[PDB]
Amino acid sequence: EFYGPDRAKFLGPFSENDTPEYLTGEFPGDYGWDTAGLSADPQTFARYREIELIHARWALLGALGILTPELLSQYAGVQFGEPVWFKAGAQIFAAGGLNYLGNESLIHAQSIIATLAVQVVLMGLAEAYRANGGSEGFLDDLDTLYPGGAFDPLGLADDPDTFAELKVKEIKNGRLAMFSCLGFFVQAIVTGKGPVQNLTDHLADPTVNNAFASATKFTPG
Amino acid sequence: MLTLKIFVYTVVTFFVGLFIFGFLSNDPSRNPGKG
Amino acid sequence: DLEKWYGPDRKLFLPGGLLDRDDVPEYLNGELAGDYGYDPLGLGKDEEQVEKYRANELLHARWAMLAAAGIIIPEGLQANGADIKGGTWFETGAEMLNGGTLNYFAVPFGVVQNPLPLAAVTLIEIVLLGAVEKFRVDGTGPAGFSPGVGKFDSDIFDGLDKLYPGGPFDPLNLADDPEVFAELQVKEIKNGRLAMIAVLAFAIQSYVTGEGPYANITKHLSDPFGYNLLTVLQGDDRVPTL
Amino acid sequence: SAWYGPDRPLFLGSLSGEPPSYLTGEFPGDYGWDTAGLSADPTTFARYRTIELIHARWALLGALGIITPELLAKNGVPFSEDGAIWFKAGAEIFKEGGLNYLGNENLIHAQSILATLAVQVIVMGAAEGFRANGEAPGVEGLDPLYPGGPFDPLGLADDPEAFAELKVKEIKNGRLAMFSCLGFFVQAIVTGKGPIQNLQDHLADPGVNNAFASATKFVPTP
Amino acid sequence: TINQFYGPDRNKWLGPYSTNTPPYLTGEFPGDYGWDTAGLSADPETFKRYRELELIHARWALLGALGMVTPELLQDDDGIMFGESAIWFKAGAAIFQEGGLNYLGNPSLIHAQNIVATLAVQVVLMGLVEGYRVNGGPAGEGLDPLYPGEAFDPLGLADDPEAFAELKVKEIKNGRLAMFACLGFFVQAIVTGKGPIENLTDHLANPAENNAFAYATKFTPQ
Amino acid sequence: LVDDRMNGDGTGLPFGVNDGILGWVIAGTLGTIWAIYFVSQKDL
Amino acid sequence: LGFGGVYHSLIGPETLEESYPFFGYVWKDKNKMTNILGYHLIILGCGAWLLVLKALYFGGVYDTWAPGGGDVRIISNPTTNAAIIFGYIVKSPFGGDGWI
Ligand code: CHL
Ligand code: CHL
Ligand code: CHL
Ligand code: CLA
Ligand code: CLA
Ligand SMILES: CCCCCCCCCCCCCCCCCC(=O)OC[C@H](CO)OC(=O)CCCCCCCCCCCCCCCCC
Ligand SMILES: CC1=C[C@H](O)CC(C)(C)[C@H]1/C=C/C(C)=C/C=C/C(C)=C/C=C/C=C(C)/C=C/C=C(C)/C=C/C1=C(C)C[C@H](O)CC1(C)C
Numbered sequence A: 001e002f003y004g005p006d007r008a009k010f011l012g013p014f015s016e017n018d019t020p021e022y023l024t025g026e027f028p029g030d031y032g033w034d035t036a037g038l039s040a041d042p043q044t045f046a047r048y049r050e051i052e053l054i055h056a057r058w059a060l061l062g063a064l065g066i067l068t069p070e071l072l073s074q075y076a077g078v079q080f081g082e083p084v085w086f087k088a089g090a091q092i093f094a095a096g097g098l099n100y101l102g103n104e105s106l107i108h109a110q111s112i113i114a115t116l117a118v119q120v121v122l123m124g125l126a127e128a129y130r131a132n133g134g135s136e137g138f139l140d141d142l143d144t145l146y147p148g149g150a151f152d153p154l155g156l157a158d159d160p161d162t163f164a165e166l167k168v169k170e171i172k173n174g175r176l177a178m179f180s181c182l183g184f185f186v187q188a189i190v191t192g193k194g195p196v197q198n199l200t201d202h203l204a205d206p207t208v209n210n211a212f213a214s215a216t217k218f219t220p221g
Numbered sequence B: 001m002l003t004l005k006i007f008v009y010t011v012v013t014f015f016v017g018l019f020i021f022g023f024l025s026n027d028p029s030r031n032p033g034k035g
Numbered sequence C: 001d002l003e004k005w006y007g008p009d010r011k012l013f014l015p016g017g018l019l020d021r022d023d024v025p026e027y028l029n030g031e032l033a034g035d036y037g038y039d040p041l042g043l044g045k046d047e048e049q050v051e052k053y054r055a056n057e058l059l060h061a062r063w064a065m066l067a068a069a070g071i072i073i074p075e076g077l078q079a080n081g082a083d084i085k086g087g088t089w090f091e092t093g094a095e096m097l098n099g100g101t102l103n104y105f106a107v108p109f110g111v112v113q114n115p116l117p118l119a120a121v122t123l124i125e126i127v128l129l130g131a132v133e134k135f136r137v138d139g140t141g142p143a144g145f146s147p148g149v150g151k152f153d154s155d156i157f158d159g160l161d162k163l164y165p166g167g168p169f170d171p172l173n174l175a176d177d178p179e180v181f182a183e184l185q186v187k188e189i190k191n192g193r194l195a196m197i198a199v200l201a202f203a204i205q206s207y208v209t210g211e212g213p214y215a216n217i218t219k220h221l222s223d224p225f226g227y228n229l230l231t232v233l234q235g236d237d238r239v240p241t242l
Numbered sequence D: 001s002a003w004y005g006p007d008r009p010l011f012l013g014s015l016s017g018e019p020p021s022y023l024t025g026e027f028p029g030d031y032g033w034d035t036a037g038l039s040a041d042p043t044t045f046a047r048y049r050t051i052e053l054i055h056a057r058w059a060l061l062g063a064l065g066i067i068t069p070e071l072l073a074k075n076g077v078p079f080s081e082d083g084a085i086w087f088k089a090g091a092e093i094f095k096e097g098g099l100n101y102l103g104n105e106n107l108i109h110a111q112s113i114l115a116t117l118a119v120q121v122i123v124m125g126a127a128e129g130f131r132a133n134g135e136a137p138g139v140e141g142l143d144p145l146y147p148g149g150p151f152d153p154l155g156l157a158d159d160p161e162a163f164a165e166l167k168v169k170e171i172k173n174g175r176l177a178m179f180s181c182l183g184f185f186v187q188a189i190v191t192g193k194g195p196i197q198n199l200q201d202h203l204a205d206p207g208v209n210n211a212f213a214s215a216t217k218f219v220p221t222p
Numbered sequence E: 001t002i003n004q005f006y007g008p009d010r011n012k013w014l015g016p017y018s019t020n021t022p023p024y025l026t027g028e029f030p031g032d033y034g035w036d037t038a039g040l041s042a043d044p045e046t047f048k049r050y051r052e053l054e055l056i057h058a059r060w061a062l063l064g065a066l067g068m069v070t071p072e073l074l075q076d077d078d079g080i081m082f083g084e085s086a087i088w089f090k091a092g093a094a095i096f097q098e099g100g101l102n103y104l105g106n107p108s109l110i111h112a113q114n115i116v117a118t119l120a121v122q123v124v125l126m127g128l129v130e131g132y133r134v135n136g137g138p139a140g141e142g143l144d145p146l147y148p149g150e151a152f153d154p155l156g157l158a159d160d161p162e163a164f165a166e167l168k169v170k171e172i173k174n175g176r177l178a179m180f181a182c183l184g185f186f187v188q189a190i191v192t193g194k195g196p197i198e199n200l201t202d203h204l205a206n207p208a209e210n211n212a213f214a215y216a217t218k219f220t221p222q
Numbered sequence F: 001l002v003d004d005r006m007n008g009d010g011t012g013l014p015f016g017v018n019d020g021i022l023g024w025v026i027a028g029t030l031g032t033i034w035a036i037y038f039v040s041q042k043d044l
Numbered sequence G: 001l002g003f004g005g006v007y008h009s010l011i012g013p014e015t016l017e018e019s020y021p022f023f024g025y026v027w028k029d030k031n032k033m034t035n036i037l038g039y040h041l042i043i044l045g046c047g048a049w050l051l052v053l054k055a056l057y058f059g060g061v062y063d064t065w066a067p068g069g070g071d072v073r074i075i076s077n078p079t080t081n082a083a084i085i086f087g088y089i090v091k092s093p094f095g096g097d098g099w100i
C-alpha cells in the first residue's frame, strides 16, 4: 500500500507485470508511471521529483487561488474588481485599482511596475535561499526539499511513519491540483468563463452544455 | 451500356496486366540453353 | 590528380592520335604547371628560357585575372542600375579628364563619392606600384601584420621562393601540401590563360562594336542571330533575298 | 540492402560521419539520427523505441483514415457537407443525421457523443492495459512490442531475415505516415481544406498554389 | 582571471547562493554557471551533444540578432531604401514585390524574384555545409567538431590557450545574450506587430505605459 | 432526346474513362495482378 | 563530323577502354550504358529547351491560329498544366481524340 512492491500503481493490475526496475517505490507518490523513461538515472530522477514537488505545491496555491474569489463573489455575495481569474490581472489598470475585499481601504494598489519590482526582489531572495538551501549558519542544514524546521510550526513533521503517509497525501493532492489548474488553463481559452461559472452552467443542463459544444470553435477556415 | 463498358475495361485490364507481368517475370530465363 | 597535368603522360594541346608523344619539344617535359607541349614557334629555346618566360606569363596571368574582373563587374553594375558613372572600361579614364571623379561602388554598401583628383591618384599609383615592383625583385618588405603569420619581420622574404612566395602571401594556408599546391598551380595558370584570352577579346570586341563586353553578352543573349560578329560587321541590314 | 550491421544506410549519407556508439544498427530504422541525444541510456532508448512504433502504427491508421473519406466523397459517396474533410468529421455528430457511415442513413447513425466516447474509453483502456501489462486473457507471455500470435494471423513473420526486412519496412512506412500526419495537422490549420483538396489545388498551378501562398497569412498585425 | 570562470570557485548562475552545483558540472567547459536545475544533462554524452547544439544555436542567434535590426537601423526617414520589408518579420514578402528583393533598394544588387529557386539553392548549400560540419570536407576532416579553427579562424587569436578559453566564454556569453534577444524579438513580434527598434523608440518616448503591460490584455479569451 | 447515351466519345477523356468507376476498376485490376505477381515472384 | 567519323573509322583507337576509360564501355556494364543514356537524355532536354527558349524569348514560331491568317507570334504564358499534358498523352488515338 503506497510503498514497496505491493504498492498502488498507475494502471492497477495492468501495471503489475511491466514496471520499471528503477521505480522501486522508496520515494513517495510512486505509482510506476515512467512509461516514457525520462528518469532512468536517479540523479535526474531526484531533479525531476523536486521540480514535481515544487509544481505540486505551487498548483495547490494556484488551485486554491483560482476558486476562492469567484466562489466568494457568487456564493458569499462579496464584490471584487473581477472574480474571473484570467481577468483579475487587468483590474489593477482600472481607476479604482486592486482591492483585497472590494474595499478601497485594503491594499488599493495602482502601480503595476512597483508591485512587479517588489514581487521580483522578494521572490528572487526566497527562491535563491531555497535553491542554495541556506548559508552561513542559519538554515545551513536539512534536505532542501522537506525542510521541517522554520517551516513546520504545527509539529506535524515528526512521527515519520505517518509523516510519509501524509507526504504521499501531499503528492497525490498536489497532482490533483496540477490537473485542476491545467483544466483551468484550458477552460480559460476554450470557454472564456470562470471555472465555477462553467460548473454552474454545467449544473443547469449537463446534457447539452459540456466541453463538446465548444469543440467546434477552433476549426480552421 | 455502362456496366458493359465496366466489364470490358476489367477484362482488357486483366489481360494486359497478365501480359506485362508475365513478360516481367524472368522471361529471358525461359530458354533450353545456357544463360 | 597530378599525373594528368605532370609527367610524360599528361594532357597535351593536341590528342594522342593527332600528336605523337615524341613530337613535344624536349624542354617541355611536364615539370611546370600548365605544360601542354604547345610551342610551335622557336620561342622556348631551352628550359631556362622557358623558366624565365614563365615569370612573365604568371605576372601577365594574374594581372589579366584582375583586369577581366575589373572590366566585367563595374560595367555590369552600371548597366543593371548602380551609380557607377563610367562602368565601361575603354571610357572610364575620360570621366576624370577635367574635374570629374569616379564613384566607388563597394558592394553592398556602395555609392561613395571619392574626392581624390586625377593628379593625386596618378601620383599615389605610380609611387605604390613602383614600391611593390621594386620589392618584388629585391624580395624585401619592412613591415608586417598579415593573417598568415602575426606581425612578420623584414627577414622573412629572404630565403623564400620567387614567383611563388608562401607565408605572408598565404593567409588561408591550403598550399603546404605539395600535390594540391601543384594542382592549384595548374588551376591558376589555366585560369590566367583564360583571363588573358578574355581581356584580348574585351579589347578587340570594344574596338569592333564600340561598347563593353557586358553590353555585348547581354545583347547577344537577347538576340544571338540579331547581334553577333556577323551583324556588327555588316552594318545596318541587307536587302531581303526574295 | 543490408539494413543492419555496421554498414547500414545512415541518416545523412556519405556526409553523416560516425554514428553514435549505442546505435549499432541492431534495431530497425537505425540510421543514426540521434542528434539531440535522448537515447544514451538503453532503457530510455527502448521506451522511446516502443513509443515511436506505437506512434507509427497509430499514424498509419490515422493517415489512411484522413485520406479515404475525402476521396470517397469526391468519387460519388454521399458525404453531405463536411464529413469529407477530417477536421470537420467530428462535427457530424451534433447534427440530426449523425455519423452516417458512407452516406447511408441506416449505417451507424450515431448522435450520443458521450456514449460513443465512453465506450471508446472502456474498450481502448482495456486494450492499452492489456498491451502495457503484456498479458491478456488467452494470451501467454511474449514480446510486448512485436507480439504476433493472434495479432499476426497470417503468420508470415516466421522467417527471421524476412521478419527483419519487414520490420525495417514497417518502421519506414510508419515514419513516412507520421511525417504525413504532421503534414496534415499543419496543412489543415494553415490552408483550411482537406489534404486531397490541397493536392488538387496544387496540381492546377504549382507555381502559385504552394506553401508560400499562405506565408503572409499569419503575419502579426499591430 | 581563468579561476574566476573555470575553477571550482567560479562565478555561477546564483552568485553566493549556488552551493548546490551538480557534481558532474565541474567547470571544464565554457560558460558553466551551474544552471542545471532540470538535471536533464546528466548523461555525459547527452551533455556533450547538448553543448554542441547549444553553441550552434548561439552562433545562429548571434547572426540572427545582429541581422534582424540591421535593415531597420539602415532604414531612412520615409522608406525609399526599404519599403514594407524594413521589418524583420515581414522581410520575406520582399521576394513577392513587383520590383523584386533588392539588397539595399537598388536593382544592381541581388534583385531576386524566385523564392522557390532561392530556397532550393539554400537547401542544397546548407545541406552540404551541415554535412561537412558533422563529417568533414574541404576545410578539415579530423578537426574538433565544435572548434575547428584552422580555416574558419585565419586571424590567429585562438593560439594562446588562456586567451582562447577567455574568448570562448566570451563567445558563449554573447551567444546566450543573443539567444535571449532573439526570443525577445519573437515574443515582441507576436504581441506588438512592430519592429524591435521602433518598439525601443516607443518605449523611450514614454516608459510609464508603453510596456508589455500595454499588451497584456491582447490574448484575453473573450 | 429520344434515347440515352453516355456521349463520352471525343472530349479527350483520359484513357477513355467518363466515370470514376472505370479508373477505379482499372487501378484495382492492375493492383490485384501486381500484388499476386509480387507475393508470388521468384517462383516463391 | 565527316572528318571525325572518317578519322575514328580509319586511324582512330580500335577499342576505347585501354586508353580512354571515360569513353570505354562494354555492353554488359549497365551502369556505363545508363551513364551514356543519361548524357544523351540531358542533350535531348537541352535541345527541347532550345526550342522553348526560341519560342519564349527569341520572338519566333509561326502561329497559324493567329487572327488574320497566322503570324510569327512570340509565345507568352505557355500552358504547363500537368493534367493537360498527360491528358494529351493518354487520350485515344481515334478520330474524336487523335491522341497526340
Ligand atoms: C488523435 C485524436 C484526435 C484529434 C487529433 C482530433 C482533432 C480534432 N477533433 Mg476530435 N480529435 C481526436 C479525437 C477525438 N475527437 C472526438 C470527438 C470530436 C468531436 C465531437 C469534434 C471533434 C473535433 C475535432 C477538431 C477540432 C478543430 C480544431 O481544433 O482544429 C484545428 C486543429 C487541428 C487541425 C489539429 C489539432 C491536433 C494536432 C495538433 C495533434 C496534436 C497532438 C494531440 C493533441 C495529442 C493528444 C491526442 C489525444 C488527446 C487523443 C480537431 C481537428 C470537432 C470538429 O471537427 O469541429 C469542426 C468536433 O466537433 N472531435 C473523439 C471522441 C469520439 C475523439 C476520440 O479519440
Ligand atoms: C543574488 C541573487 C540572484 C538571483 C535571485 C538570481 C536569479 C536568476 N538568475 Mg542570476 N540571480 C542572482 C545572482 C546572479 N546571477 C548571475 C548570473 C546569471 C546568469 C549568467 C544567468 C542568471 C539567470 C538567472 C535566472 C534563472 C532562473 C530563471 O530563469 O527563472 C525564471 C524567472 C522567474 C520565474 C521569475 C518570475 C517572472 C514573472 C514574475 C514574470 C511575469 C510572468 C508572466 C506575466 C506570465 C505570463 C504567462 C502567459 C500569459 C504567457 C534567475 C531569475 C539566468 C537567466 O535566465 O538569465 C536571463 C542566466 O542565464 N544569472 C550572477 C553573476 C555571477 C549573479 C551574482 O550575484
Ligand atoms: C529561423 C528561420 C525563419 C523564421 C523564424 C521565419 C519567420 C517568418 N517568415 Mg520566413 N522565416 C524563416 C525562414 C525562411 N523564410 C523564408 C521565406 C519566407 C517568405 C517568402 C515569407 C516568409 C515569411 C515569414 C513570417 C511569417 C509570418 C508569421 O507571423 O509567421 C510565424 C511567426 C511566428 C509565430 C513568430 C515566432 C517564430 C518561431 C515559431 C520560429 C522559430 C522556431 C521554429 C519552429 C523553427 C522552424 C524550423 C527552422 C529551421 C526554420 C515569419 C516571421 C512571410 C512574411 O514575412 O510575410 C509578411 C513571407 O512572405 N518567409 C525562407 C526561404 C528563403 C526561409 C529559409 O530559411
Ligand atoms: C561576438 C560573438 C563571437 C565571439 C566572441 C566569438 C569568438 C570566437 N570564435 Mg566565433 N562565431 C560567431 C561569433 C563569435 N565568435 C558567429 C556568429 C559565428 C557564425 C558565423 C561564428 C563562427 C565561428 C567558427 C566556425 C569558429 C569560431 C571560432 C572562435 C574562436 C576564435 C576565433 C574568433 O572568432 O575570435 C574572435 C575575434 C573577433 C575580432 C570578434 C569578432 C567580432 C566581429 C568581427 C565584429 C563584426 C561582426 C559582423 C558585422 C558580423 C557579420 C557576419 C559575417 C562576418 C559572417 C573565438 C573564441 C573558431 C574556433 O572555434 O576557434 C578554434 C572557429 O572555428 N567562430
Ligand atoms: C560522338 C562524338 C565524339 C566522341 C564520343 C568522341 C570521342 C573521342 N575522341 Mg573525337 N571527334 C569527334 C567526335 C567525337 N569524339 C568529331 C566530330 C571530331 C572532328 C573535329 C573529332 C576528332 C577527334 C580527334 C582528332 C581525336 C579525337 C579523339 C577522341 C578520343 C579522346 C577523347 C576526346 O574527346 O578527344 C578530343 C576531341 C575534341 C576536343 C573535339 C572537340 C569537342 C568539343 C569540346 C565540343 C563539345 C561538344 C558540344 C556538346 C557541342 C556538340 C556539337 C553540337 C553542334 C551538337 C575519344 C574516345 C582523339 C583520339 O582519337 O585519341 C587517339 C583524337 O586524336 N576526336
Ligand atoms: C487516370 C489517370 C491516368 C494516369 C495514371 C497512370 C498511372 C501509371 C503508373 C504506372 C507506373 C508503375 C511502374 C511499375 C512498372 C513495373 C515495375 C515492377 O516490375 O514491379 C515489380 C518490382 C519487383 O521488384 O516490385 C517493385 O519494385 C514495386 C514497384 C511498382 C509500384 C507498385 C504500384 C503501386 C501499387 C498500388 C496498388 C493499386 C492497389 C489496388 C488499388 C485498389 C483501389 C480500389
Ligand atoms: C508522469 C509522466 C510519465 C509519462 O511517462 C511521461 C509524462 C507524460 C512526461 C508524464 C506526465 C506529466 C504530466 C501529466 C505533466 C503535467 C504537469 C502539469 C499539468 C503541471 C501544472 C502545473 C500548474 C501550475 C504550477 C499552476 C500554477 C498556478 C498558479 C501559480 C496560478 C496563479 C494565479 C492565481 C492563484 C489566481 C489569479 O487570478 C491568477 C494567477 C496569479 C495566475
Ligand SMILES: CC1=C[C@H](O)CC(C)(C)[C@H]1/C=C/C(C)=C/C=C/C(C)=C/C=C/C=C(C)/C=C/C=C(C)/C=C/C1=C(C)C[C@H](O)CC1(C)C
Residues within 6 Å of the ligand: D033, D034, D035, D036, D037, D055, D056, D058, D059, D061, D062, D063, D064, D065, D066, D085, D086, D087, D089, D090, D178, D179, D181, D182
Ligand atoms: C528522431 C529525432 C532525433 C533528433 O536528434 C531530435 C528530434 C528532432 C527530437 C528527433 C525527431 C523527432 C520527430 C521527427 C518527431 C516527429 C513526430 C511526429 C511527426 C509525430 C506525429 C504523429 C502523428 C500521429 C500519431 C497522427 C495520428 C492521426 C490520427 C490518429 C488521425 C485521426 C483521425 C482520422 C483518422 C480522421 C478523422 O476524421 C479525424 C481523426 C479522428 C483526428
Ligand SMILES: CC1=C[C@H](O)CC(C)(C)[C@H]1/C=C/C(C)=C/C=C/C(C)=C/C=C/C=C(C)/C=C/C=C(C)/C=C/C1=C(C)C[C@H](O)CC1(C)C
Residues within 6 Å of the ligand: E035, E036, E037, E038, E039, E057, E058, E060, E061, E063, E064, E065, E067, E068, E087, E088, E089, E091, E092, E178, E179, E180, E182, E183
Ligand atoms: C539552461 C537550462 C537549465 C535548466 O535546468 C533547464 C532549461 C530550462 C532547459 C535551461 C534553459 C534553457 C533556455 C533558457 C533556453 C532558451 C533558448 C533560446 C532562447 C534559444 C533561442 C535561439 C534563437 C535563435 C537561434 C534565433 C535565430 C534567429 C534567426 C536565425 C533569424 C533569422 C532572420 C534574420 C536574421 C532576419 C530576417 O529578416 C528574418 C529571419 C530570416 C528570421
